[PDB]
């Protein structure tokens, strides 16, 4: 069954289900190894298994499928995807795939996909005739984004000052030049939570490096 | 038939202005209903404020277009009426204003405009002396519905919206903004 719910759950719940599923010596190793072994024994029983993730293609064309919670780690949780899915199913790099998964047979370390059920929150059928990103003609920042919470929060003054100094917009290209000890990290988290609260339709994610 | 063409253009401008104010009012009511909620579509709220600005600017531009079109139509109509009546009764007007016409017949430009101002102010004083009676007169002979359906003055909705003055920079920025508005509406 779906591995995301057992992936985002904390380690305690995973280990407790580990003891109650019949394997009690699966605590002293990595989270990826724990989930790999638990799902291995679970699929060995012969039950329905569901998977999801984001794919990527190596140099040889054979691809991997990583998970967002694992921070795209090259652990056993990844799923093998063949170039044939790309060649006929017409799936590009990084397409979010959710659907059936196959327990790998002997000599196969990583899982495989049986069939695809959802691609980029859309049906896999109409994803074939999808316009490319670079083929779209761009324009300037037509839309305007407001960073004010509107509830009079105790920290809304920072967002209001940011709006007054430099309004932000959709599809804009902006930089925040700052020396160290500038308080930038928490103002980025503040604008992130502001756009999450004000705009529940647009997708939000934050990239952390080193 | 230039008169009828002018009337058709004036009516087209009036209808366009009326439907522009119709979509304007629709825009304000829709924006108000969407603003009744809190934080639902803040980006769409800003877009609605922008569309309100665009619609009001375009309504002002259409109102100005209609005002100048109506002024031109009235000017042409009064020119035609005065011209026809004046061919009918120009001899008596010339007789009552003979010295100025002898002055204009052969004199130079400075004396020409001197006779011009003499004739004009003499007829102004005659007109202001006569109009003390203040009698009521109907429209022209064949220009009844011309002066009926067009209207004596532009509607009161055309004077409260044209008082806002926009600089050419505002006009051009709103024109290009409406340009991308039309581009989006095409899609
Ligand atoms: N709006 C604010 N309200 C309160 N304190 C603020 C505000 N902006 C900046 N500061 C202060 O500025 C300092 C910056 O702290 P913080 O750890 O957020 O910085 P940072 O720029 O994200 O860090 P670094 O550059 O070291 O990674 C803190 O002392 C913080 O209290
Ligand atoms: Mg920081």
For residues A114 and B127, give the distance between their C-alpha atoms in angstroms, rounded to a whole number: 99
Ligand 1 atom, smallest distance to A185 CA: 22
Residues of A in contact with B39 (CB under 8 A): 149-150, 197-198
The token duo for B17 is: 């202005």
Bind-site residues of A: 169-174, 181-186
Interatomic CA distance for residues B18 and B158, integer angstroms: 10
Domain of residue A108, CATH code: 2.40.50.140
Q: What is the dihedral of CA A36, A41, A45, A46, to 10 degrees?
A: 20
Domain that residue A86 falls in: 1-126
Distance A208 CA to ligand 2 centre (A): 11
Displacement of CA A9 from its chain's centroid (Å): 15
Is the separation of the CB atoms in B94 and B101 below 8 Å?
yes
- Among candidate residues A29, A93, A21, the one with its CA nearest the CA of residue A64: A93
- Kindly identify which residue of chain A lies nearest to residue B46, measuring between CA atoms: A144
Cα-to-centroid distance, A180 and ligand 1 (Å): 9
Give the closest of A149, A197, A199 to B43, CB-based. Answer: A199
> Hey, are the CB atoms on A144 and B180 less than 8 Å from each other?
no
Considering only CB atoms, which chain A residues are within 8 Å of B43?
143-146, 170, 199
Phi/psi of residue B151, nearest 5 degrees: 105, 145
Task: For residues A102 and A100, give the distance between their C-alpha atoms in angstroms, rounded to a whole number.
Answer: 7
From the list A57, A13, A67, A63, the residue with the least C-alpha distance to A38 is A13
Q: How far apart are CA A129 and CA A89, in angstroms?
A: 11
Q: What is the resolution of this structure in A?
A: 3.7
State which CATH number among 1.20.58.1090, 1.10.10.10, 3.40.50.300, 1.50.10.20 fits the domain covering B1-187.
Answer: 1.20.58.1090
**Does ligand 1 have an atom closer than 6 angstroms to the CB of A90?**
no
- Residue A160 near ligand 1, beta carbon < 6 Å: no
Distance from CA of A193 to the nearest CA of B (A): 14
Cβ distance B42 to A198 less than 8 Å, yes or no, reads yes
Ligand 1 within 6 A of CB of A21: no
Chain B contact set for A199 (CB, 8 A): 42-43
- What sign has the CA pseudo-torsion B121, B125, B128, B130? negative
Contact between A80 and A63 (Cβ < 8 Å):
yes
**Is the Cβ atom of A181 under 6 angstroms away from ligand 1?**
yes
Structure tokens, B90: 């120009």
Residue of A120, A4, A14, A105 lying closest to A51 (CA atoms):
A4
User: Residue for token digits 């004000």?
Assistant: A198
User: Smallest Cβ distance to A142: which of B39, B42, B180?
Assistant: B180
Q: Which residues of A make up each annotated binding site for ATP?
A: 169-174, 181-186
In the reported structure, the alpha carbon of residue B63 is separated from the centroid of ligand 1 by a whole-number distance in angstroms of 54
CA of A187 from ligand 2 middle (Å) equals: 9
B46–chain A Cβ distance below 8 A for any pair = yes
């Amino acid at each position: 069954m779906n591995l995301t719910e057992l992936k985002n759950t904390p380690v305690s719940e995973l280990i407790t289900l580990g003891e109650n599923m019949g394997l009690e010596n699966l605590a002293r190793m990595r989270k990826q190894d724990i989930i790999f072994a638990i799902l291995k024994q679970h699929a060995k029983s012969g039950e329905d298994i569901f998977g999801d993730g984001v794919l990527e293609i190596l140099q040889d064309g054979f691809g991997f499928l990583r998970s967002a919670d694992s921070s795209y780690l090259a652990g056993p949780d990844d799923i093998y995807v063949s170039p044939s899915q790309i060649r006929r199913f017409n799936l590009r790099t990084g397409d979010t795939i959710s659907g059936k998964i196959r327990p790998p047979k002997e000599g196969e370390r990583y899982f495989a996909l049986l069939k695809v059920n959802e691609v980029n929150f859309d049906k896999p059928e109409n994803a074939r005739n999808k316009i490319l990103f670079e083929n779209l003609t761009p324009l300037h920042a037509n839309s305007r984004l407001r960073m004010e919470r509107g509830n009079g929060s105790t920290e809304d003054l920072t967002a209001r000052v940011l709006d007054l100094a430099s309004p932000i917009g959709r599809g804009q290209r902006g930089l925040i030049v700052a020396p160290p000890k500038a308080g930038k990290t928490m103002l980025l988290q503040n604008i992130a939570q502001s756009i999450a609260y004000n705009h529940p339709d647009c997708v939000l994610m934050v990239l952390l490096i080193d | 038939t230039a008169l009828q063409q002018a009337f058709d253009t004036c009516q087209n401008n009036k209808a366009a202005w009326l439907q522009r104010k119709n979509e304007l009012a629709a825009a304000e009511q829709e924006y108000l209903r969407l603003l009744s909620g809190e934080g639902r579509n803040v980006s769409r709220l800003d877009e609605l404020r922008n569309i309100i600005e665009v619609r009001k600017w375009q309504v002002n531009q259409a109102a100005g277009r209609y005002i100048r079109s109506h002024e031109a139509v009235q000017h042409i109509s009064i020119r035609d009426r005065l011209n026809d009546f004046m061919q009918q009764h120009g001899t008596a007007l010339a007789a009552a204003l003979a010295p100025e016409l002898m002055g204009y017949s052969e004199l130079t430009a400075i004396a020409r405009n001197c006779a011009i101002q003499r004739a004009t102010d003499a007829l102004r004083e005659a007109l202001l002396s006569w109009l003390a009676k203040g009698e009521k007169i109907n429209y022209s002979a064949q220009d009844s519905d011309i002066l009926t359906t067009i209207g004596f003055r532009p509607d009161v909705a055309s004077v409260d919206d044209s008082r806002e003055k926009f600089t050419p920079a505002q006009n051009m920025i709103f024109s290009r903004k409406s340009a991308q508005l039309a581009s989006r509406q095409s899609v």
